Design a protein around this ligand. Structure first.
Ligand SMILES: O=C(Cc1ccccc1)Nc1nnc(CCSCCc2nnc(NC(=O)Cc3ccccc3)s2)s1
Ligand SMILES: O=C(Cc1ccccc1)Nc1nnc(CCSCCc2nnc(NC(=O)Cc3ccccc3)s2)s1
Lengths: 308, 308, 308, 308
């Protein structure tokens, strides 16, 4: 109703979260370890295309697990709910097992689930074509704003990803992939997708596409089917913030997805999309400043799912 | 926008669900076993007080676990989020343990959590006064419509409730109750609350109070604080349908709570409250006709939480 | 071969273990909390009736969980392997669940298993007669040496035993007891059996009866059937030392059973029985001096099950 | 005392077990699937070198998991208890997790534990030299009797062993191997060791070496240290028969190790070693005829660990 006044509040919330200096920058690969703990950016894109940024909103960082709801949305857009969910579950798991009782990954937001979803997209073509296809989808979601790639993060993630190779071999053992899948090639594609780079600005447009029923707000183009968006938002709401998912659902009540680079892709349905980014993570793997910002945003603007 | 046309659709959905003859009427106590499998009623109360009923909507039945979100709402209304959640958790558990890692019941929608919530209400007074206090709250939620009591169900539940006595003694062992709690007396109060009787009509008004931000739509009276309603709706959405909670959240996306008598208390935020009732339950403990009706309602009217 | 020389070694091992001052005396009831941490006794009874004691070997203490293999032996002696094991399992559990996948307690050495075994002995008579019957069996096992009773420990265990009442109600729920069992009465009998008092001297004769194929070495009387003794020794070997059972089996390799009063009932098959007692327990619930003594005994005399 | 009469009983037990036609021959690789379900052999080697065979005792088959206690014995012989158990646990697990709470495989008898033990033997040399070293040890254990190799089983196990590659990558992730370990090379060596072929006759000599305190009974040569043998027998007793380990310990009470080719390596301490072989396996993965034979042997000869 008054965007200028809303941005003053966003700036005040950004300043309050800026003081939260806690957390640890992820350091399992050098490409993550090098990031300054003081980098902090918040970008907003409303469903009507109004924009606002504060802080470090043009510094590229990897999507990491923030890409999981995006590739899940692409798979449902192309294949439908029924086909996708023959391979992956629909609910959160309690706070280590690679598969649920039905030999399926628990949901698309955990590594095993995202690895399986990766195997469903553009089957039958080489990895260069699969990657180009997802890149063109991400460009449409961001209204052609910054979508890049970190080869150094890709190389390091693959070289050091023993846990993801253990998951790949266990999924292969339990026949989790579509028949004729080259599992090692799927792991390559998975590491590549995690290594896609965005800024707070471009990622806020991707979150706004999810908030706007699948239509990119800065172009007006239909990018994702209503079904893909609805499924993605439901799973971001219950499975998107690692083992903090349940507490985030109760106190924040918004669909969101965190990543190890410090990003939090946030959706306020029919209102706006946001990307909050600060490299230091708490014990759950979520950006300390971003979590603080999310709690403050809902308390101030009453954006919670069940707020009257 | 057009209530008369909406009731025609409700009637059509009722007729389609009426054909779903599957399921088994609960038979662990004779008071449940005696119910006809053919009883089926649907009642609606909009946030503006518009009413509609079809089927067996004036036959009393016990709330059973449908009372859990109601007594949780009373506890938060009187004590606040912080105090209540020092004793009970805020998230769903995976598909048997009485307590989570912090020695707290997982959430207010499981037996252990509801037993703990029962111990927080009107502390310091006798059971007759505690029960009268909850009854007056339930009368306000229902706009003074049918709120009764089944002494036979209370007597049978207590006599045969070995699992709930095992939970009571384990909670006592782990110091789960407020100091000075008489655990056996809390179990009596718990069994009494489960044995409160409603009809589809009166229970639909209680669900409409939750849909209307805590204000009873047929009286205009404020019954529950905004915080109590918001917390209750969040926990009904993620924990309300037993081990079907996760699948209900994904496909239906509405706050709901089932009970072993075949009731499903359903909330469509800012639109209406409903009570669906049919004694035969599926393997998850949820009313077969009610589950079928809930899926059909969301597919027809687009009431899902993340529907654009 | 040379008992006089063997007792010199027992005395040396006693002196070395005497220096191990670590551990904490159990303090959940005052009757355990009052024991001096410096009390330390070791008694030996060979299969030929040769006796040796060092330290505090005539100070009475409660058997506590040391009674579990004894009442299990009585149940198998009277009912046979097949009947007893229709109610209780035969193997160790990993390091909290009251029942295994078949709704049976894991084994007779855990509380749930011992509560079920208690329900199988002398069915059909009052508790006074059941207790007198077990007392006469324990007197025969000890060659009529010290077998007493601590009413104060019985009263305190029952008053504070919420976890055991939670187990009793869960076993009742899952139909774990023989039909017509009065569960509360079984819990009374269980608490009474745990409160039976022995000295190191009399308990060493009970352990020697188990080492001598069921024949009391100081009387020559057959007390337990060969089958009862064989089953009891197998379960003491794999399930007798709480969560230390697996490490005790590997490094010590002898059938043994610990209790919260600091007792360790030890059997060296066809050689001797022993009772080691020192109230301070380690984090696993086992007597610190007794564990140290057991490891030293096997390293010195080569008593391990698989020692050549 | 009378070997001629004992062999008459062995023949009678062989004939009774021959009638047990149940079970399913393992068919996950063609090299196992091709074996006749009617092949059944029993070989005995006493600690004094007396021999007896009945049935198909010269038909080669793969050791498979029967090799696990043998390579564990080699590792303890060369490195000692302390060093080996810094990498692997000492106890049975309940009836799927790759590691225990300390990030160690549960014991040397499960795949993860055997893979870790494989990484400890002859570190620093190529796989050809590691394999030759283990082969020379196995030749000494068997008194230079049949020790062969199945290249077809090795090739198939490696090609189809996705679960073992998932375990290898998870162990690498959790730093389970000695520093500088080439995990893929360890998996090659592991598959090779499982593919070593024996007959009932030669394997009975290996079991007799374990029964004779590490001395080969047909040569008199010391092959394994007393410590290696004692540790191996303890772990075969509690962890050797898959999820049947606990029931085998209680009813049979002998150290034994089964394999998917239908072999059961059995040790009767200070008496004899045996190899029972019949390809059809029960639901636990144990040879049906061999399990039946083991139960009958203990009931007839009173060979149980705790038999008086
Ligand atoms: O995590 C600890 C230590 C610890 C730490 C803390 C506490 C205890 C223990 N150890 C670990 N070791 N490996 C780990 C990761 C891979 S789990 C092995 C492969 C599987 N992946 N999915 C599976 N799903 C099912 O097996 C389905 C199912 C579910 C339920 C019922 C039946 C069937 S099995 S975690
Ligand atoms: O359910 C089966 C058989 C089965 C069936 C199917 C499959 C397997 C087994 N057997 C059962 N036996 N009793 C049962 C119910 C009462 S559970 C005992 C009392 C407790 N209540 N809450 C607790 N919470 C924690 O202990 C917290 C914690 C969580 C995680 C880590 C540390 C600490 S312990 S279910």
């Amino acid at each position: 109703p008054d965007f200028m006044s809303f941005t003053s509040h966003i700036d005040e919330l950004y300043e309050s979260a800026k003081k939260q200096s806690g957390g640890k920058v992820a350091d399992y690969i050098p490409q993550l370890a090098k990031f300054s703990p003081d980098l902090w950016g918040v970008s907003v894109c409303t469903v009507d295309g109004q924009r606002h940024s504060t802080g470090d909103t043009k510094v590229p960082f990897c999507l990491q697990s923030c890409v999981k709801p995006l590739k899940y949305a692409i798979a449902v857009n192309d294949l439908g709910t029924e086909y996708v969910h023959r391979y992956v579950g629909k609910e959160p798991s309690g706070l280590k097992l690679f598969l649920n009782e039905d030999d399926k990954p628990h949901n698309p937001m955990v590594n095993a689930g995202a690895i399986v979803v990766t195997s469903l997209i553009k089957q039958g073509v080489n990895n260069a074509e699969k990657f180009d296809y997802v890149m063109q989808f991400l460009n449409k979601m961001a209204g052609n704003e910054y979508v890049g790639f970190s080869n150094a993060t890709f190389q390091s993630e693959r070289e050091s990803g023993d846990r993801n190779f253990a998951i790949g071999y266990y999924l292969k053992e339990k026949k989790c992939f579509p028949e004729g899948t080259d599992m090692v090639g799927i792991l390559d594609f998975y590491f590549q997708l995690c290594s896609i780079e965005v800024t707070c600005e471009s990622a806020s447009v991707m979150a706004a596409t999810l908030a706007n029923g699948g239509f990119c707000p800065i172009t007006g183009e239909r990018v994702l089917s209503p079904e893909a968006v609805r499924n993605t938002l439901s799973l971001m709401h219950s499975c998107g913030m690692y083992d903090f998912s349940g507490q985030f659902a109760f106190h924040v009540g918004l669909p969101a997805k965190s990543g190890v680079a410090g990003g939090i892709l946030l959706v306020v349905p029919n209102v706006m999309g946001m990307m909050c980014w600060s490299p230091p993570l708490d014990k759950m793997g979520n950006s300390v400043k971003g979590i603080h910002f999310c709690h403050d945003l809902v308390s101030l603007c009453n954006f919670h799912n069940y707020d009257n």
